Structures are given as structure tokens and as C-alpha cells.
């Protein structure tokens, strides 16, 4: 009986592969051939934020494109002012092993996380003026690797127990569980309409989830190692991934298959982050060799570099209006480029 | 605008008040020593943790030695894959690796050796030093001194091994027990001494779960680690 199920699964995989092969008729490189190259991009460090005692693990931009939050090994959450560089808050965490941070779209909350199997919620708009912890959401059986907001009362969190979850903060309970991954879920990304999200999970496969029902609509494979970062395209019909085999890939939801690969022989490090620009023409990746690269999303060429860090680049971020990009690093400094 | 000036002044005041507390926190962060505790179910790391103390993802222990502060982080309630959350411990002074020497054949000793080799050769832990505890010495001695359990069955090289010159047997111990102990220690040292780098070393001890000198050994090994780091920095070592 079990062998029959295995053979049927193999046949279904063959059927899906045949369908995908049938659908393909031309390459994205062929389609976007006559388009003129972007040329060359030379951004420059406009700011440099200091105040963290150790290596930075995460940062998330605010919806107003002015404030941002960051998390560090020293166990501190800091809210900056990008324009002036004056700190606005410094929240002390109960644990120093934090892997992710997020800011609410309203701007009244931030979310911590990490190896203690929890992401907490902190209220920035207390009348007393003190940033206290509001909710503490428990229930994951492995470390937390992402904790992202949908609104002021919904958060979607990734975990190192192979499952994602949706929480309603008011009562502090789960509402759905997203099972089906075999490895460790390592990243997250909400759709622009916030009706679907993607995730790569350390088994070299990304998935497509329906938030309302809680099921895996699509599965994307093609990477050779662990997937570290994942971003959505501006229009919501594609996404990009970053893995440990030193390459990035572009996938299309409707076509159901890969479109392009962003790799080079000289690159043998792992991608830690990926992000798209405002119009989606540029794909920016931060590597383990202390540098970030600027890729032409439609042409696959290399256009620039962000070489201003002296240790691992662990995080990336573009503003909600394309004004600038931030990058944290293991050398404890946040840098802003333009 | 006067309102803009007032807002900017208040912003600068808040920034200064935050910088002051960060400066106060930097000293406490710099004058504290963080240690990662590894091991296995077989190894008596639980008893060692109890002696040091005398769905949480990590457990934390704090002990003080001569006005020095140590933070020992014990991983608990995590899946069995390690290649991801082992990178969170790049900046710890030492790793306390507890391995039960009285557990040779499943080949628990071989599994422990493989884990040690992987941790030693990892890329984000290439400047961390290991304080290796070889536990269950009494059980090892009792097993070897009387029984048909033969190490050469599972470690064939044990046949052509004799106690090293620098051995310091405990007065009142069998040559066979001493030979077995030092063979296991040499097996663990063969991996670490082969690096030939100079940025990290191993510190082996022969321990029992109820030993009262483990905290002193950790203290002395941390002192040696820091002294060696400085000596290497100043071009002496």
C-alpha cells in the first residue's frame, strides 16, 4: 500500500513536470532582450547610525519612510529617525538571541522574536510614555525567524519547527497553522494585497499560502540549498528568493515556474537578504562577503554594488516610496544609501 | 520656526538621554562572559548544570566567581537540526562540550567525535575555544576494570596505543584504566591540534558529574583564553 502511494506520488510529480514543460515557450531573457540596459548605479552612504553594542540581526522600515527599528545581539531594540539620526526609543529585551523585528503599518507597535520561541509585541504609544510589552505569543516549538504584521491585531510568524502560524493579538491565540514544510522556515513575505504569502524553508523549496483558508496552493522548487530570503514583486504576481548556493531566482505565480537566475562564478557566498526597488526594476541582495549587489531584474546583469560594510550584511530594506535603502551588518552599523 | 526648533531640541535631549544609558550598558556587556553548553542525553550535562547552579527555547544560568560574572546558555526545546541556530553563538568566550567517555559501543563516542569535528571546523565558530569535559570517569573505570567490553572492537587503533609520556595517573588507578582514559582524550585532541591556526585551543579535563571543581576549571580556562588572546595580539605568542 505504501509503495503504491509512493509510485502514485512519483507519477503526479511527473505529470506536474510535464505540464510545466508544456507551458514554457520562451525565456524571460529572450523576451526582455531589446530593452536598454539600466546602465550603472552608484549609490552613496548618506547616513550611518551608531549606538548598538553588538552585531545587528534585523531591521524593518516604517510606513512613513522616515523611522525604522533594528535588533541586535546586545539585546536592544532601537527606533531611529532616519533624517536626523536621533534615537527615539531603546527597548531592552529579555533575551539576547533575537532573529527578527517588525513595525506595524500604523506605527504604534513593534515585534521582537528569536531563539526563545516567542515574538513579543511592544506598545510605542503608551500615555505614560514608557514602551511596555503588550502581548507575548507562545505556541511554537522551535525558534522564531519571522514575525510580520497584517494590521494592528494580526501577525504572521515563521518558526524553526517547520510551521508558520497566524495569530490574533487581542486574545493571544493562534487562528491557523500552515503545515507542509519539511525543513526550517527561514523567511516570509506578505502579498501587496495581503491575501497570500510565500516562504522558503531550508529544504530548497518555496510555497504559496492562502491566508483565509490555510492551505498550500503552490510549491516552487529549483534551489539546491537552504533558502534564506524571499521578497514579493511590486505587482504581486512574482517573487524572488535567496539561498546558500550563491544564487537568486525569480518565480512567477501564474506560470508556476522559475523565470531567471542571478548568479556569477566569482560569487561563492550565501545570500542573506533580497529586496526590490519601487518599480521592481532592480533586485538588491546582501551577501556573506560583506557586500551587496545590484541586479537588473529583467536582464540578469550586474549594475552596481553597495560596498561600505566590514562584516556580514544581515538585513536589507527599501522605503515605501523608493527614497533610500538601508542595510544592517555584523559590524554593528546601519547605513543608508541613495 | 520656533516650533521646529523646540521639536529638534527635544529630539536631541531624548537622544542624549538614550546615549547615556547605552554608555552605562556597554561596560556591563563588556565585563560579562558568555558560555555555550553542549552535550547529549547520555552525557551528564544535566548534572553538571545542577552543580553549576548550586517550551522555552533556551535556558540561562548565572554564577559568580571572585566578582566575575558568567552567563551559561543551555539549549533546550529545539529540533535536532543544528546548522542554523548554532550561528547565534559566534561571540561566546568558550563552549563547554560534555561527552561521556564511558559510552563506547550505537557508537555514542563516535557521534560525539563527529559533532566535535563539525563544531570545530564550522566557519562562524573558528575563533571559539572548547572546554571539553570527559564525564563518567567512575563508570568508565568500573566498566574497563571488570568485563568483556573491548574498545579495540570499536576503535581498532586502541591495540597499538600506550600511555603518553606526560601522563599523570591518579595514585591508585589501574594502568588499563589510565590507558583507556588517555586514549579517549588523545582521540579528541587529534581533531583539534590538527588545525594549526592559533586562534582557538581545546582544554580537556577528566570530570565526574558531582565534581565541585568544575566552576574553578571554567574560570581558569577563561582566564587562559583571554591571556592567550592578548599575548598573541602583542606578537609574543
Amino acid at each position: 500500500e505504501l509503495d503504491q502511494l509512493r509510485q502514485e506520488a512519483e507519477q503526479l510529480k511527473n505529470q506536474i513536470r510535464d505540464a510545466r514543460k508544456a507551458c514554457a515557450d520562451a525565456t524571460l531573457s529572450q523576451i526582455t532582450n531589446n530593452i536598454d540596459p539600466v546602465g550603472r548605479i552608484q549609490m552613496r552612504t548618506r547616513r550611518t547610525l551608531r549606538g548598538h553594542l553588538a552585531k545587528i540581526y534585523a531591521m524593518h522600515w516604517g510606513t512613513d519612510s522616515r523611522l525604522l527599528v533594528s535588533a541586535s545581539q546586545d539585546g536592544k531594540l532601537i527606533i531611529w529617525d532616519s533624517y536626523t539620526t536621533n534615537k527615539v526609543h531603546a527597548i531592552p529585551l529579555r533575551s539576547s538571541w533575537v532573529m527578527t523585528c517588525a513595525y506595524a503599518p500604523s506605527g504604534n507597535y513593534v515585534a521582537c522574536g528569536g531563539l526563545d520561541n516567542i515574538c513579543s509585541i511592544y506598545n510605542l504609544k503608551t500615555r505614560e510614555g514608557n514602551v511596555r510589552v503588550s502581548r507575548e505569543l507562545a505556541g511554537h516549538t522551535g525558534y522564531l525567524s519571522c514575525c510580520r504584521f497584517l494590521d494592528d491585531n494580526q501577525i504572521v510568524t515563521s518558526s524553526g519547527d517547520t510551521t508558520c502560524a497566524l495569530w490574533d493579538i487581542e486574545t493571544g491565540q493562534q487562528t491557523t497553522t500552515f503545515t507542509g514544510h519539511t525543513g526550517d522556515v527561514m523567511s516570509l513575505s506578505l502579498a501587496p494585497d495581503t491575501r497570500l504569502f510565500v516562504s522558503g524553508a531550508c529544504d530548497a523549496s518555496a510555497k504559496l499560502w492562502d491566508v483565509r483558508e490555510g492551505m498550500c496552493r503552490q510549491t516552487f522548487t529549483g534551489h539546491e540549498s537552504d533558502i534564506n530570503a524571499i521578497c514579493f514583486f511590486p505587482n504581486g504576481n512574482a517573487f524572488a528568493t535567496g539561498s546558500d548556493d550563491a544564487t537568486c531566482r525569480l518565480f512567477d505565480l501564474r506560470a508556476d515556474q522559475e523565470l531567471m537566475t542571478y548568479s556569477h562564478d566569482n560569487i561563492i557566498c550565501g545570500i542573506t537578504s533580497v529586496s526590490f526597488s519601487k518599480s521592481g526594476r532592480l533586485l538588491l541582495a546582501g551577501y556573506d562577503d560583506f557586500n551587496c549587489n545590484v541586479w537588473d531584474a529583467l536582464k540578469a546583469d550586474r549594475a552596481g554594488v553597495l560596498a561600505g560594510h566590514d562584516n556580514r550584511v544581515s538585513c536589507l530594506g527599501v522605503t515605501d516610496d523608493g527614497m533610500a535603502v538601508a542595510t544592517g551588518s555584523w559590524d554593528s552599523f546601519l547605513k543608508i544609501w541613495n | 520656526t520656533e516650533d521646529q526648533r523646540n521639536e529638534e531640541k527635544a529630539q536631541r535631549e531624548a537622544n542624549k538621554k538614550i546615549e547615556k544609558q547605552l554608555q552605562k550598558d556597554k561596560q556591563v556587556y563588556r565585563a560579562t562572559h558568555r558560555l555555550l553548553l553542549l552535550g547529549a542525553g547520555e552525557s551528564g550535562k544535566n548534572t553538571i548544570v545542577k552543580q553549576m547552579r548550586i517550551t522555552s527555547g533556551i535556558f540561562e544560568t548565572k554564577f559568580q566567581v571572585d566578582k566575575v560574572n558568567f552567563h551559561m546558555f543551555d539549549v533546550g526545546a529545539q529540533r535536532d537540526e543544528r546548522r542554523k541556530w548554532i550561528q547565534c553563538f559566534n561571540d561566546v568566550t568558550a563552549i563547554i562540550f560534555v561527552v561521556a567517555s564511558s559510552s563506547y559501543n550505537t557508537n555514542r563516542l563516535q557521534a560525539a567525535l563527529k559533532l566535535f569535528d563539525s563544531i570545530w571546523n564550522n566557519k562562524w565558530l573558528r575563533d571559539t575555544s572548547v572546554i571539553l569535559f570527559l564525564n563518567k570517569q567512575d563508570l568508565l573505570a568500573e566498566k574497563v576494570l571488570a568485563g568483556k567490553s573491548k574498545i579495540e572492537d570499536y576503535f581498532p587503533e586502541f591495540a597499538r596505543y600506550t600511555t603518553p609520556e606526560d601522563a599523570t595517573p591518579e595514585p591508585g588507578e589501574d594502568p588499563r584504566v589510565t590507558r583507556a582514559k588517555y586514549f579517549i582524550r588523545d582521540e579528541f585532541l587529534r581533531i583539534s591540534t590538527a588545525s594549526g591556526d592559533g586562534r582557538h585551543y581545546c582544554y580537556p579535563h577528566f570530570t565526574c558529574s558531582v565534581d565541585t571543581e568544575n566552576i574553578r576549571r571554567v574560570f581558569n580556562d577563561c582566564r587562559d583564553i583571554i591571556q592567550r588572546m592578548h599575548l598573541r595580539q602583542y606578537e609574543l605568542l
Partner: nanobody
Amino acid sequence: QVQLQESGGGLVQPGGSLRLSCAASGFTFSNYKMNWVRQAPGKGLEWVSDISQSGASISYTGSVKGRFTISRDNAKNTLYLQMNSLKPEDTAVYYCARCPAPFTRDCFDVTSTTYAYRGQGTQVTVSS
């Protein structure tokens, strides 16, 4: 997608010889360090041997030294484990786990929670 398929098992009289093989696809074979593991009934998984990318850093477990030999051919993406003079204690399932990442000298690939880059297995039995 990463694929590892092992074949060449069966039942062999004690003192005989065998040869397992494994074919890999979906990744560059020459950039990863291969590996063999096994799981006897009633026991957990145990590491057997491994080999480097170029094929010059072989190493075996204690209880198989001299008998087993591991060789990899990067021109055909295949791994082999020549077993000689088997014993009744070598009855188990043999897998072909792989390095988690390329170009590294590390490995965490014996985990009970199914390692993603591990094969399905091949049955080897030794009886009189």
C-alpha cells in the same frame, strides 16, 4: 529538485561482497562532500563514512575499517560503497546523505527529523 536514489542491496551470505550505488541529480555533484549512513532495526541512524569534493579526504567509522571502501565519480554523479566480508551485524538500511551547503568543511546530516538531502535507502541483509 534534489534527488538521491540508492540501489544495489539484497541478501548476501556472511563473508561475501556487495556494492551499493547512488545516483544524484538536481544539484552540482562536484561541489559537495558525499556521505553514507545506516540504521539497523531497533537503533538510530549511524554515520558510516564520507568523502570530500575532489575525493582525497576519505574517512570511515571504527567498526568497518579495512572492509568498506567509498569512491565517488564526479563525471557521472555517482557514489559507491564496496562492502567486503560482511557480518551479521551489518544488516540495516543504507542512505546517501549530503552536505547541507557547498564549499564548506562542515556537516550536520544524520538527524532523525528527516534530513532533506538524504536518500530513501537500500536494504542489505546478511544471514546464513
